[PDB]
Amino acid sequence: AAQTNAPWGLARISSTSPGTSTYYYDESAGQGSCVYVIDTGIEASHPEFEGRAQMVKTYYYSSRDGNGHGTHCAGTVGSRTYGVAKKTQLFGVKVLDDNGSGQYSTIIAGMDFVASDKNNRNCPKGVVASLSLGGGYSSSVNSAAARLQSSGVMVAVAAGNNNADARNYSPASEPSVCTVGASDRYDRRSSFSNYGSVLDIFGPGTSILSTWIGGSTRSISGTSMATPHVAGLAAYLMTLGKTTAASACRYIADTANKGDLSNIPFGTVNLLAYNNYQA
Ligand SMILES: [Ca+2]
Ligand SMILES: [Ca+2]
């Protein structure tokens, strides 16, 4: 398939070169996979989700995304226009309030929720969790991410937007999950993107156009935005059978565009998520 005039991030993940505008991807498009978007919720009624998005869990008075962050990342995972895996099922886990903040215990609970809730869902092609959230280091948040990964969920987490070594942030620093840095459309590391040895992959993170609440769209930046690219990519690849949840991060790293990013600090991987699709 070929989506012309796609968001640059989508075009980038299907390109060996920057600066193209068409997103290429196998038409299976992640059908049969599921992606949990652990964030501020998902405006499931957004026409861009085509009925494939639903709130499965909230820890606040409403499952509504009154923030937009989670709708935006869910859109990058699997919305029809702005999504990597345009046929995946999107499950919203609102661990962040509408101010985009959530206690670590809530975040941990939501991660443990997903590890269990996937047994209530039909995801024969596999389960992904997109964690576009970050805070200071926490062995308990890391262990919850590790448990989620261990349970058979491909966990993609944001490296963080502190322009710092992600070793001091959670769940970014958890080794067993896929820690995602941000790049821009000129294949530069996003100025805000965390880095370090714990980073597994870079995805498009600067000026990422996707869905927003109120049935709208908007472009925002963050490793929070690169994560759904990798999460959507994992779901896409798992649907293709090219990898499993346990090995998707390694597979994405192996098949990534290598050495194409600039301003990657010494010791950080120079890997850009790449669907390796040949039309
Ligand atoms: Ca987003
Ligand atoms: Ca890792």
CATH number for the domain that contains residue 22: 3.40.50.200
Distance CA 229, CA 215 (A): 21
Q: What angle do CA 40, 170, 147 make, to 5 degrees?
A: 85
**Angstrom distances, CA of residue 111 to CA of 70, 74, 101, 143:** 15, 16, 15, 10
- Nearest ligand by distance to the CA of 39: 1
Q: Residue 54, SS3?
A: strand
Q: Is 69 a catalytic residue?
A: yes
CA distance 134 to 3: 31
Closest CA to 144 of 184, 183, 102: 102
How many angstroms separate the alpha carbon of residue 189 from the centre of ligand 1? 17
Eight-state DSSP code of residue 223: H
Options 26, 39, 165, 184, the catalytic residue: 39
> Which of 46, 69, 72, 229 is an active site residue?
69
Gap from CA of 145 to ligand 1 centroid (Å): 19
Q: Convert 9-45 to b/e letters by CB count within 10 Å (16 or more is b).
A: bbbbbbbeebeeeebbbbebbbbbbbbbbbbbbbbbe
Rounded Cα distance between 65 and 67, Å, is 5
Ligand minimally distant from the alpha carbon of residue 223: 1
Q: What angle do CA 80, 243, 51 make, to 5 degrees?
A: 25
Give the ligand with the smallest distance to the CA of 67. 1
**What is the CA(185)–ligand 1 centre distance, in A?**
16
Which residue ranges make up the annotated binding site for Ca(2+)? 16, 175, 177, 200, 260
Let me know: does 84 contact 236? Beta carbons within 8 Å: yes
* Way the structure was solved: electron diffraction
**Catalytic residue, candidates 15, 28, 132, 224:** 224
The amino acid sitting at 5 is N
Task: State the total domains in the chain.
Answer: 1
Dist CA 8 CA 186 (whole Å): 10
174 alpha-carbon distance from chain centroid: 16
Q: Does residue 171 have a cis bond before it (omega within 30 degrees)?
A: yes
Is the C-alpha dihedral spanning 56, 136, 168, 188 positive or negative?
positive
Mention every residue, 6+ apart, whose C-beta is less than 8 A from residue 181. 159, 166, 189, 190, 193, 194, 195, 199, 201, 202, 203, 205, 223, 226, 268
> What Å distances lie between residue 241 and 199, 227, 238, CA to CA?
24, 21, 5
**Dihedral-angle region of residue 94 (phi above 0 means left; psi in -120 to 50 means alpha; beta otherwise):** beta
Residue 4 in tokens: 């012309």
In the structure encoding, which two tokens stand for residue 243, read together?
A: 């990898």
Q: Determine the structural domain holding residue 206 and report its residue range.
A: 1-279
DSSP 195: B
CA 81–ligand 2 middle distance (angstroms)? 29
Judge whether 60 and 36 are in contact, CB under 8 Å.
no
207 in catalytic set? no
Determine the distance separating the centroid of ligand 1 and the alpha carbon of 46, expressed in angstroms.
14
Strands 126-131 and 153-158 turn out to be: parallel
Resolution to one decimal, Å: 1.6
* CB contact at 8 A, 238 and 126: yes
Distance from the CA of 258 to the center of ligand 2, in angstroms? Answer: 17
Annotated catalytic residue 17: no
Ligand number nearest CA of 172 is: 2
CB 164 within 8 A of CB 186: no
CA of 260 to the centre of ligand 1 (A): 23
